[model samples]
Target: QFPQLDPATLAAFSAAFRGELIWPSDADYDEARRIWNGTIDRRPALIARCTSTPDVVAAVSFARKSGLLVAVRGGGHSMAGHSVCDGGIVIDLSLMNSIKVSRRLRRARAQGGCLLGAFDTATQAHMLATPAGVVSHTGLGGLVLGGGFGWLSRKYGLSIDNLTSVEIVTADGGVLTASDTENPDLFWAVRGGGGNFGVVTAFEFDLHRVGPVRFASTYYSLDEGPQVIRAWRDHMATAPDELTWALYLRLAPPLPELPADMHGKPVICAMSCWIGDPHEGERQLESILHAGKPHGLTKATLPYRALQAYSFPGAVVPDRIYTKSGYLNELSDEATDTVLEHAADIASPFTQLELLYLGGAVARVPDDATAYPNRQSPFVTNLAAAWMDPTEDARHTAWAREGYRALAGHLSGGYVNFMNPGEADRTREAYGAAKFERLQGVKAKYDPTNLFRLNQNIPPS
Candidate 1:
């Protein structure tokens, strides 16, 4: 049984706390507990909304002293809803969102609570950027820790590749600055180790000069999928590192650019972004634009921030989400067929099969350089299913599973960010046996008690 938190204990804890503390009785407690995944409906005993390092230390110390289960929430975007837990202490870090950029150093320092949007907006002010995930609202803390990648990844590198250092709060309640020189072991683990190490209070990343980018997209009918994807795959092999392209297989939504009759029709969307010279970028895209007689086309020359922030028309408004993803050694003919066959049977407009091209800077990193794994995989695919009703959960879930099942031959490993939270029973395989053992060593040294075990956990054992 969990230790009982006495009223006197809570009263004493409140006196020393610097941030807002919400209990179940508070009026804002309901809103405060809501996270990105609407399906996660949990009630924590107390929500410690930390505002600074001291607050985080005090909260962690109090949780340990009280013997309460701990849940750390940064953007609260965990696919498995690990950001919150029942009858636990949620060390909420959303209020600590802040960032500082140094143009001269070409580096940035962002608070753990900051979202990718905040980091992008801050860095872009100086015409600088760092590789981050697609969705702007995703929390920086979780994304960077899980090995982040985006449209810019092929050109620059994965987000962890750009990570310079981090200020992490470990289980001892000591705030340590981890980097290549300081607490090197912890730094290596946090790169792609998820939250197994500790709570990161701040992160420092190396930024790049990224200005207006060329965003090109061509949406084609379902019948042309094989050809379109085949062409897209072949072209990416020769495309420059400055260009990053992805494919979306889903039912087309009624965007103003699409032909009116094609609304709700199945389509293969080829979306790409180029960060190099404008004319050359456009020149390289001609093949994809003509790969298939397109049903809908949209192109824009926009800032890197806008390109990163842009959301798709079918942006799933559904409250629930289920996803399965894997890294493919190659997008072979058989692999393309499997995905297209699955895409054709999509049951929800919100459901999308995302194919991300991985190479260039993403591949140059040594496999063991940091904790992130699968550096050589050329492509990653995710089947994301979204629906509004609870009763249909089984059907939508089965769609993702069945689709992934068809592509098993193409699968090499899975992505930590995309896998179901508790479903990472195969995390040892995902990280490879040798790397998993190294991660366990780091886990033993820093978090032997596994105080921060909410994420895709790596046991000290």
Candidate 2:
């Protein structure tokens, strides 16, 4: 249980930070504990809405001195609920959301708290974008730190590839800048180390010359899922780096764009975006879109930002949620079929499976260069489970575990940002052996006591 803090300390925090400090009696207390996945339930003694770098430093120092657990809250979109802690202190970064784009420089610096929606809007104005997440509402901090995948992955590489620098608040309450030039080790760790080192206040990214408008989105049916998947696999394995793509298998939501008959049916949807000519993007996707005769196809040339729009509206609402994931070299034929078979058996409509195509720029980086240690693989798979009730928790969690095993066994690890409490060991697996050891040493140096251990914690050496 969380013990109450002295009145003097509370007053000091309120006076020093510009953002809100939410206690149990506060109006947003209930909302503060809720995360994006719609299944995680946690209670933090205090939610410090840190609006400034100094605020983050103060919160870190206070939590350390008080011997209280601390969790970092970015967009609160983590499926594992690492953003909040039970009976601990939460340094909420949501209030600091802001995006600044330099059109002439063709670069952008987004605040740690900014969402993909805000990042996309700002960068699109300059016709430039870094690799971003599929879901628009995901925080830039968590996604980038976790090596983000999206419509831009094949073309631009993971989000870490585009990262130019990071402004972080270390465990010692020092606001330091980490980049290739300054504190490069810290920079490499933050790139894919999740939120281990400290709280990032800003991220400077190298924006590529992208589009004013490009490809739109489309979907396919289970009947055509296999063919589409195979075609996508072959093409992506050899396709030019300019193309970006992903595949999803899930029950269809009741959307007006889809036929009423197939509304609730399981579908194997293919979504892609290319930074090149619109006609070329469509041409490349034609075979996969029509292969095996899809039940429906929603395709066209729309604005570049339109790709991000496809992921909106149907996201998991704020609540408790669980996610199980892994990395793969290639989706074997058996694994592909497993996804199709189990996809039809999803117990809840909210549960879905996503597979990301990783090659091109994502693979160009050496494994030892950064903590984004999964580069040896060419594919990543995720099982996202969600439900509103606490009673069905066991059932939902079992479904996720079963799904992970049912898939091809080549998957060795999971993403740290996507990890839950029980999966901390898997976090090291995600970082690989060598890089994982290096990360542990960095953890030892900056946080010898492992103060920032709430996340898929990589303990200090």
Candidate 3:
């Protein structure tokens, strides 16, 4: 256990601090500790809102000297509940949210706290973007480090693929730059190694010209699943690079486009995006419409930045949420049956299953090129449970767990971002043996004592 935190020492550290230091007695303490997944509610002793890179370094030094556990907060959507710790220091980066874009260079630099929305807005001012997730509030630090992917990834690759460099404050209060040219090993480690190395203060991303994408969603009844999903999967498996899509097995919500009587019933939804000419998208996206007798449809040619901010109803921060995920080399009919079987057992209305098609640029990358090694996988499956009742946590969580177990026969390795605090036993398997060993080596060099251990940790060798 760490030593008791000294109030006098904290006061001295606060004297030179440039940002707000929230204490337990602070008026906004409760609000400051709030995060997306409500399952983890901890009262941190101190919350430092670092405004600059120097502030991050000072916070790290102070936490080390005081022997206090340190939790890092970005956009506050840590799936594993690592953003806050009980009676420890939360080096919050919310105040550091800022983005600088260079249109001429087609590049952007983002502070650690910048969310997916912030980055998209800053770069999309010039119709520039990087491959980032659908959720706008997810922080860049964790997402990029843990292998970020989304609608644009099929053509442009992952968020990490576009990263040019990172500015990090190490455990010893030493600030350093990581890139392919400087500290190359560190650069490789940070690409997909999670937050085991240090506190990344800033990220520089290589941007691409993309926006006003063709987005479409077609919904069908569960009875049409066998023919509809099979057709959609087979067609999408070899679809154009400009096309990106996912199929959802979810209960139909009362959407304006859907029949009122169909609400609260299981349905198959095929959502897709075409990143090329609007006219071209029309013919290409028509395949999904003809896949089956769609019950409802929503189509738009919207700005990437605007669409990035869109969240489906009931997806706002949940009172409780759990997720089980795995990768599939191919979306087989047998695998689809497994998904359908488990989807039938969903315990909560908030629960849903997502089968995302992954390929093109993301899969073309060499397996060992970066720290992320699952380049061979063609699709990812996420079974998510979201609910409001704490007493029903068992029921919601079990749904995800049992679903994952049943689908294990058709699955392989998993994505780091979808992992949780309860899945420590599968960490090494998730990274694979070779990559995990190399990550441990990097951990030893950069953080020998494991100062940053709250994430999917790679201990020092």
Candidate 4:
């Protein structure tokens, strides 16, 4: 048995680290455990905010030798609340958010805990960015590890596709770097395998030369759900790969950007992003606003950084937030209708349903090239419910579950990040049997004891 940590060992561990070590009774314990997605409430016995690689090594060593359930907290964006574990030792990377760009090598080395915003902001100064996630608040670490999607995904590949090297702390407390030249199996696993290997202290991503800004925004209609859905689907199918769009038949939130007559009404909306020429981007989108269509268009061209935070900026939910996700091989006509039917019933402002258009580079990747298993499917849908309030909780929960079940026939499989908690049996479906087995083999090599167990866990052999 691994030695159980005593008070003296805990105290020694805390004193040796540069970052603060937190416990349940500490002043910031509640805040530390609260994650981005109002759901996770795990109370680890010790939460170590690692500020350097050595600190990560020490944390890994302590947890491996001391037998505490170890949880690695990235940007804490997992819908399954995998960022925190109860009565465990948490290696929190939030303290190590650093992004340094090298325009020469066309790469940047990011500290393990940094979010997409910081990386985007830094790299954009040179008119560059590798594809990041949809939400700015999502941790760069988690997104890159699991496979990131953004406006530029069609042009570039997933975030992991651009990843160059990663520094990890192994189960036995040794530091290793994974790349094409070093530890290639671990390198392949880190590329879309999820964080099943080790505690990554830093990552070096190969950057892309991108635009300084993009022309992108959303458009909506109150009563034209069918027409809008059909139009957008057809348009996106043949639309230039430079442009990306998605359909959302949702209750319009009472945000200032929306028109006064539209609040709380069911509407067909499309959020669009184009990473190419502005004139061409505008000309392509103008076709969608043709005759009998959207009541309003919120489209505008803005700096890439600004567009990055376009939707619900600064909004973060707890790790306990409930979410269900499924992938569509393609958005069939029947599937589109099912989505519109349920749109009318979503009562909670916290509820959201989206069908992201997936094609171009993301679909072009061979399924087995990296561990990201969903390339065979083109459309990805997310049915999410998030709320900080207790009174309306039951209604939100019912709406989320029913919305997904109603649209279940269309689902090919699920996206692991959006995977529901306690659905481990479906893990193989998410990554596929071949990739799943390979991932487990990598776990056996780097994290054989499962020291970094949190979020959609991949158990060791």
Taking all chains together, each candidate's TM-score versus the true structure is: 0.97, 0.94, 0.97, 0.94
- Cα displacement (angstroms), candidate 1, residue 36, comes to 1.8
Off by over 4 Å in 1: 1-3, 7-12, 314-316
Worst-scoring 10-residue span by lDDT in model 2: 210-219
- lDDT per residue as tens, model 4, 1-461: 12347777676666667887887788998898877755556678888899999898888877876788888888988777778888887799998998899888888999989988888899988877888886787888777888888788877878878888999888898999999899999998888877788888889988877763445445466466667777777777777778787766567767667788787777755777677877777887676565235555677877777778676522444333577778987777888778877777777555667878777788788887788878767788887766667676677777778878888888877777777665667778888777888888888888887767675567765
Of candidates 3 and 2, the better by lDDT: 3
What count of clashes does model 4 give? 12
Candidate 1, poorest ten consecutive residues by summed lDDT: 1-10
What's the distance in Å from true for residue 199, model 2? 0.9
Model 3 over residues 1-461: C-alpha lDDT tens digits? 23367788777677768999888888999988988878988899889999999999889989988878889888877778888988889999988889999999999999998988888988999999998999887888889888899888999999989999999999999999999999999999999998888899999999999868788887888878788778877887779989987888888877778999888888877788898887888778876786778777888888988768755655344678888899988877887887888776765667789888888999898989899868888888999888889999888888889888888988888888888669767779888999999999999999999889888888898
lDDT agreement with native, every candidate: 0.87, 0.79, 0.86, 0.76
- CA RMSD, predictions in order: 1.6, 2.1, 1.6, 2.6
